[model samples]
Target: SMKTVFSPLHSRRHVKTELDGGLLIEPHEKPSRAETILARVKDQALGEILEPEEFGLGPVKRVHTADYVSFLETCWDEWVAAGKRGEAIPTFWVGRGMRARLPKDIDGRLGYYSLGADTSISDGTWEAARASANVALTAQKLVAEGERAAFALCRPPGHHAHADVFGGYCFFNNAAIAAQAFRDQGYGKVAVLDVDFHHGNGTQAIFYDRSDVLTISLHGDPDLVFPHFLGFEDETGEGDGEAYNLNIVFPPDTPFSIWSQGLEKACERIRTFAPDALVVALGVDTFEEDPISFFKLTSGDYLKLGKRLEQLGLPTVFTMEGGYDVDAIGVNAVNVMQGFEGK
Candidate 1:
């Protein structure tokens, strides 16, 4: 049976709206996403469900900056102490020509550590984010210890969190942390294939300068999507990481046929890279009906997507990312795993 690493604390992280259409609204990345996915995993008898083992802050600090991690741990209390009434959200940012110094105040620190305002820190944000990281780490441990595959039912979906900046509803970079863990555990090389609808800018940025971990993402064109700066084909790996990173962009309303083509090419590249293991930043937000996405993929298409990944035949870990269609997210997400398992 495939082992699925999960955490109950994931349900505790909540975000008060920063801005949605110029009005406050609930964030699209909700705890219910993980809940439904977990239910589906159980219903399918996909595997044994196991609670995440606490790997603590060591593995997390390996991929994220110390200052940034510290900021996340303390931001909530600072916000509450400052008489803030709602969730802690960043309202300002340090732009071009601005000093990059860390600020002494809570608000300044929020802008310093956050890439955007969509993700806010709530009462239990830190605990939940740590739990999510533990989920990914525990799953990685299972795969590294000889499990053929494992699933990490993570929350506040990660993939958008950089080494020192949080955004896109992600606090810690779970998949990147897992990839680093694979390397630390003596794996010669690790590759991350991010199939999220939006560009995994954070994951890309974290590994942009490394050669040992090959990073590839298939997502909407950044020019017309949420992360408007990265994810271009020309923005390949830099320095020693030259040609080690790949970004496959798709325009709005891309169908499964075209999307699958991109997946096939990504798989081909992975086969050539021949990494010791693989991490999939699995996001189902590409579903045709996702509230804030622009893809046209159908439910049945996910099975095919999973089968394609199985073709890689690497010891794999599927870390949850994004999918906003609450009713369909579970089925769509599990279909990929079921397909991978040839279920």
Candidate 2:
């Protein structure tokens, strides 16, 4: 059985609604998402569950800028102190230019730190993200110490979050932090493999300048996906990171047959890197029934995905990323772990 690290802290991170396109709708990434997955993991008897032990801001700050971390820590208080009407949501954002002035006002700060309006800073958002990183780090420690693999069932999935920016319902990049923590503890080369339906733009950007941590992602084409920018196949990496970042994309409605090929592409790349350990940014939104994504992977494919990953023969840490189908979230997510275990 796998050792699973989960946190009840996410229940407070829930926001009433999120901005989707032009309308505010019920948040697709909510507390219930993690809750259901936890219940199912327990039912599957896939592993012994443990609450995340706090690792403080040191782990998270390594992956995020100091000011960015401070902003999230107090963004909610500043929003309420400003006499804002509702939850802290950004209305305007800094455009493309490399140079933009930071803002002093809370509203302006919200826009400055936000990549998209879908995520709002509500009470406990910081606490949830802070604790979520612990879940990832704890799992990394477990696997680093001789465990085959452990599940970091994180909430407010981190792949979409960047160093100084937050969006896509993520305030901190958990997998990146764990990968870095693994490296900080002395593992040399670590690979972050994102299997999310959406591109892990945040994780890529976090490691885009370093050769030590290789980043790879298979996501919906950014052209048709929520993140309209980045995730392009040609962006690659910069300076020392060239050829280290790989993005494999597919158009909407792609089936598992083709999707598996992309996974093979990622696996091949990982095998070449020969990292000390692997970080699986596991996301199940590719499920056929997912409301927001456009992939055709079924619950059964996840088992195959896990089995394939297990064959890599590297110590692994599975950090929860994204998956929206509430009814089958448990089955699909756990299938990957079960498959990895060859159960």
Candidate 3:
């Protein structure tokens, strides 16, 4: 049994649809996703459900740029005030050699700060994103305060959010904020293990130049995934962060046998780093039934993921990421958590 940190505010930010592969459809990262997982957490009786603390934007600003944070807080209102008629989404982006100056139009600013069209901003988006960060921080705090492990049931799954750009159904990098929190709280060293099906490009970018935090992700090959430009094997950390970032990619229909191989590889790296604390960007989208991902990992495989991570023996915080199958998302996510606890 462990304490799981969750926030009711997550339901506040709701959107009708998001662009996926050029079509606007129901968002996979919806509030029901978290509520379903909460149901499963209760089903397992894994632990007492705990509420997240209101740490405000201080911890969030530690990982995201101030302007980006400010933009998130005001983007919804700005869109409405600007006479926008629907959920605000970016239609344009700055490319190579494009001017970096901030624009006055809400649409232009959305394009400037957004990385993909799959995520849209609606009312209460800021409140939910802020609460998501606080949830992660509360879980990280529990681990730092001597809990063996805790879970942050963060919504708007955050592995794709960069320091200044929001995308991949993420508005803020919740897992990254937690990892940085460990360092700020004097843990000295932290490692973020992202098991999400997509690359944690945002997490990598935030820590790619530093050694205090190590970022690793096991994901679909970027050539075929949604975030199509990262997660390559050669894009290792550079300068002071050289060799600190790792990507173990798998192609479509990858079975648990091969996936577990990569998982063990990442686990071995964590053992080598010997960090004071661990952050698990726990996305269960690798499940065979996940609608948006391409992987063959089963529910049993997810249990194994938990057990293997537990082997690292470091104080761990699990930050909720993506798992689209509403029916099984809860079971799949709690499987890993319970497996880690040997429940």
My TM-score estimates for the predictions, one after another, are 0.98, 0.98, 0.98
RMSDs, each prediction?
Answer: 0.9, 1.0, 0.9
Instruction: Give a tens-digit lDDT track for model 3, residues 65-85.
Output: 999999998898998998878
Off by over 4 Å in 1: none
Worst lDDT window (10 residues) for model 3?
Answer: 20-29
TM-score for model 1?
Answer: 0.98
Pairs in steric clash, model 3? none
lDDT of 1: 0.91
Q: Report the C-alpha lDDT of model 1 over 226-312, residue by residue, as the tens digit.
A: 888889999889999999999999998899989989998999999999999899999999999998889899998999888888889
lDDT of each: 0.91, 0.91, 0.91
Give the Å error, residue 99, model 2: 4.2
lDDT comparing candidate 3 with the true structure: 0.91
